[PDB]
Ligand binder design. Structure first.
Ligand SMILES: O=Cc1cccn1[C@@H]1O[C@H](COP(=O)(O)OP(=O)(O)OP(=O)(O)O)[C@@H](O)[C@H]1O
Ligand SMILES: [Mg+2]
Ligand SMILES: [Mg+2]
Length: 855
DNA sequence: GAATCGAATCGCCGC
RNA sequence: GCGGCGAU
DNA sequence: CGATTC
């Protein structure tokens, strides 16, 4: 039931003359044919991908989950619900005893029966056409939502949350229902569902409820026609159900239309098409899916950039596209061997509360089995793409941006991937390495091993002390597994081959390995530079420092100062009344004081591992509440499951105490970060407010989106939007039944999105400034990682600091942010707008002399 | 007034 | 949307 | 612990 788009639509891509000539005028006809054939293959692979998924969803009875059937379902559902309703009054107004199926259909609300019927008849017809068997299919599906939705809807709307996540962790209808069977029995043992065990429907009841549902679908919609066979013959009287061909052609056309616009983007064998406008950049042919400069969730948001003059933004994207890459054949030769022997090549190298705790161990193996299969899937695809382009002289990647302006490569195989993917990709246009390039090659090799918390001379000494090990790895990587045991193994191996090249050829050796420089904590770095935070900036190495500054260990050091103070002074333990709000029981337990809680943590030993997740999620918006879950999940629970954690008698009390100390430490260490996110959150709060006079009720000021402009000239609009109603069932997944600004997501998004737009602007300005003031042509970019060939590494090191000093010396981005929305504020809320946070004593020009900023 | 909720972006794979 | 993986 | 909304 599908139409091959490929025969005509995909043929136009190679045939059309205006795309061919514009490509051939730059790189000739031979490369033009190769590039168009590659893009043609990408669309063909994408069509094949959709069709395999469509047929697998066809075979599994999940055809309503496919995107080609959703536009159908959304116009048939309101008619079904109106007819599902309208029956109920007719039988209630018709005297006499009710039909067999009337009472069952009241146990499930009209919306849920409308979807359950449509999905199950679509499943039964596509994947026996008798009305009896399709009636029982709905009948067993209605009863499942009736019996087990009882748990969700009424008795445990608070306690469902403690089984909702573990229900979602199960995959498969059988596993999900079996878990719900255990949940229902556990609840009844506590008298939670009213003590009423379900009386399962008889098979006679299940067929009769279905034929009521099929008949009501024919009345409301024309999706399905009824057909009788051998009418009047007692033995062979049957009714066969049929999907209406006019609606089958609707999903067929939509399946073909969607199959054309889902290509598998690949690297380019010619340089990518320079961006001159909103669309059509990157790849060279026109396409069923043309590339967009900004990845927006709506076509209206992309059209906002049409006449936006942002020349520096366009130059930055086009320069990055022009960077020539090639597959690292030496690394690829190694990876082609060890992936045949291990599922993950660097995974396991040989080297020298009982119910509720071991339930988590069982869930750990279940999660690990998912993780092992997931990691292997991506590994085999990356290796296939790397081998496909291995013998090419150079390959290129097109680039675009997310709606905040961060720069992303477009192809699935691209240098922004994991350690193996980065290890398989090297720059194509190298230069003689020289003395300076060799020095930075060793620094880059030291960072791949994980020796990055020590000053530069110690990184050099680590490489020079391990000179024998590095040369042994380059000469025979399969015979010496030392490279595989490092923090970034394949990138370390890539350094090993280049290091051996300098030994075999001297400083004239042409090297093209990308040497990445990663900023410490980019979000905190930008916030500290915004408000001139001396203490906060020094913690993220903005300032020149003795050693590499480690904000994870600084917070841990501050945490341990409170722990030892709380171990001498501090509160004692106390008994306090507690009450479970569900059961209503009033009990009394021990509330551990800070003196006891500090002693437990001092026994455990609080290091940077305890604090690392909390500050890492600070820029994402986490705070003292979120830290409690992080500490419980990352530190306390792994300790208890491994025989440690004997000090933690009440883990939630230890977690909440730890979250209080981390939040006190982080909010005192990086002050300007905390103040800046608070100010932006308050800004979005007043913008997303629908202010109104309560007496009149009239809307005085409409809720407003948040809009600002980066120093590079890239504009960004934040308008999180929410749907008005959505329905989710238990065994079968959710489905839609206009949009308004989601004010909650506006508050939760504004601070991370603002700082991410700033680091995108900084990256783009770095790429431009490095390309024009110096002569750098090759760029490796992952959002805050700046890499180039070793001979240009020192200049990139200088350029990335010069741009960051330049913007914040010239732009008050928070004050510029204020100048945008201040006209949109209402009279009643300007008094409640907090003032801009005060700037500090940090001198921005010290960033130029900072060794470990890297950015 | 309480009653409830809530506590970054992007891409791939699966349902 | 949910499950898992990866990138910052 | 605040905002948002019953
Ligand atoms: O971006 C987030 C991200 C995505 C994937 C992995 N990560 C984290 O990136 C860290 C490495 O950078 P750091 O933050 O400096 O950690 P570290 O312990 O101090 O240094 P290291 O020993 O790993 O070399 C890792 O640990 C991860 O949590
Ligand atoms: Mg690290
Ligand atoms: Mg990160």
């Amino acid at each position: 039931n599908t139409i091959n788009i490929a025969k005509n639509d995909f043929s136009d891509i190679e045939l059309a003359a205006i795309p061919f000539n514009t490509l051939a005028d730059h790189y000739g006809e031979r490369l033009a044919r190769e590039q168009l054939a590659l893009e043609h293959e990408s669309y063909e692979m994408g069509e094949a991908r959709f069709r395999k998924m469509f047929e697998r969803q066809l075979k599994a009875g999940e055809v309503a989950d496919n995107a080609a059937a959703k536009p159908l379902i959304t116009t048939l559902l309101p008619k079904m619900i109106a007819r599902i309703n309208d029956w109920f009054e007719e039988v209630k107004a018709k005297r006499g005893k009710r039909p067999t199926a009337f009472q069952f259909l009241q146990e499930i609300k009209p919306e849920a029966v409308a979807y359950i019927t449509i999905k199950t008849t679509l499943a039964c017809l596509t994947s026996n056409t008798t009305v009896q068997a399709v009636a029982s299919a709905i009948g067993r599906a209605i009863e499942d939502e009736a019996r087990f939705g009882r748990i969700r809807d009424l008795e445990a709307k608070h306690f469902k949350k403690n089984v909702e996540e573990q229900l979602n962790k199960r995959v498969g209808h059988v596993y999900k229902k079996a878990f719900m069977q255990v949940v229902e029995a556990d609840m009844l043992s506590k008298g939670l569902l009213g003590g009423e065990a379900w009386s399962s429907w008889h098979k006679e009841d299940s067929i009769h409820v279905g034929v009521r549902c099929i008949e009501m679908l024919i009345e409301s919609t024309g999706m399905v026609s009824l057909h009788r066979q051998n009418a009047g013959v007692v033995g062979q009287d049957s009714e066969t159900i049929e999907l209406a061909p006019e609606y089958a052609e609707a999903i067929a056309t939509r399946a073909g239309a969607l199959a054309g616009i889902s290509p598998m983007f690949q690297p380019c064998v010619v340089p990518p098409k320079p961006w001159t406008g909103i669309t059509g950049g990157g790849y060279w042919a026109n396409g069923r899916r043309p590339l967009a400069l900004v990845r927006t969730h709506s076509k209206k948001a992309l059209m906002r950039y049409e006449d936006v003059y942002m020349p520096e933004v366009y130059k930055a994207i086009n320069i990055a596209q022009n960077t020539a890459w090639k597959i690292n054949k030496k690394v690829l030769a190694v990876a082609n061997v060890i992936t045949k022997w291990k599922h993950c090549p660097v995974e396991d190298i040989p080297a020298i509360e009982a119910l509720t705790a071991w339930k988590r161990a069982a869930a750990a193996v279940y999660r690990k089995d998912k993780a092992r299969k997931s990691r292997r899937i991506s590994l085999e695809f990356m290796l296939e793409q790397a081998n496909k382009f291995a013998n090419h002289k150079a390959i290129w990647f097109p680039y675009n941006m997310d709606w905040r302006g961060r720069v992303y490569a477009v192809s699935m195989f691209n240098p922004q991937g994991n350690d193996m993917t980065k290890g398989l990709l090297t720059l194509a246009k190298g230069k003689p390495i020289g003395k300076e390039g060799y020095y930075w090659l060793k620094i880059h090799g030291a960072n791949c091993a994980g020796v990055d918390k020590v000053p530069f001379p110690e990184r050099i000494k680590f490489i020079e002390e391990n000179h024998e090990n590095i040369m042994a790895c380059a000469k025979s990587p399969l015979e010496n597994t030392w490279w595989a045991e490092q923090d970034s193994p394949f990138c370390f191996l890539a350094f090993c081959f280049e290091y051996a090249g300098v030994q075999h050829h001297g400083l004239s050796y042409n090297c093209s390995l990308p040497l990445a420089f990663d900023g410490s904590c980019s979000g905190i770095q930008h916030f500290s530079a915004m408000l001139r935070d001396e203490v906060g900036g020094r913690a993220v190495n903005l300032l020149p420092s003795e050693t590499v500054q480690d904000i994870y260990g600084i917070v841990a050091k501050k945490v341990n100062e409170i722990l030892q103070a709380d171990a001498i002074n501090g509160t004692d333990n106390e008994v306090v009344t507690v009450t479970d709000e569900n059961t209503g029981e009033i009990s009394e337990k021990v509330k551990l004081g800070t003196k006891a809680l500090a002693g437990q943590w001092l026994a455990y030993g609080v290091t940077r591992s305890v604090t690392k997740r909390s500050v890492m999620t600070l820029a994402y918006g986490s705070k003292e509440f979120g830290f409690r879950q992080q500490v419980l999940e990352d530190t306390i629970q792994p300790a208890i499951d491994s025989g440690k954690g004997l000090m933690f008698t009440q883990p939630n009390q230890a977690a909440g105490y730890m979250a209080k100390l981390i939040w006190e430490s982080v909010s005192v260490t990086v002050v300007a970060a905390v103040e800046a996110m608070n100010w932006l959150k308050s800004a979005a709060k007043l913008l997303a407010a629908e202010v109104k006079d309560k007496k009149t009720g009239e809307i005085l000021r409409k809720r407003c989106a948040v809009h600002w402009v980066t120093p590079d000239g890239f504009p960004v609009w934040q308008e999180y939007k929410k749907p008005i109603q959505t329905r989710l069932n238990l065994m079968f997944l959710g489905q839609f039944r206009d949009s308004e600004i989601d004010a909650h997501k506006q508050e939760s998004g504004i601070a991370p999105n603002f700082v991410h737009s700033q680091d995108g602007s900084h990256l783009r300005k770095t790429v431009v400034w490095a390309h024009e003031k110096y002569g750098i042509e090759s760029f490796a970019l992952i959002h805050d990682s700046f890499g180039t060939i070793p001979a240009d590494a020192a200049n990139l090191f200088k350029a990335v600091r010069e741009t960051m000093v330049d913007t914040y010396e010239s732009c008050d981005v928070l004050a510029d942010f204020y100048d945008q929305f201040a006209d949109q504020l209402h009279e009643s809320q300007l008094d409640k707008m907090p003032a801009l946070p005060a700037k500090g004593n940090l001198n921005l020009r010290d960033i130029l002399e900072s060794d470990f900023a890297f950015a």
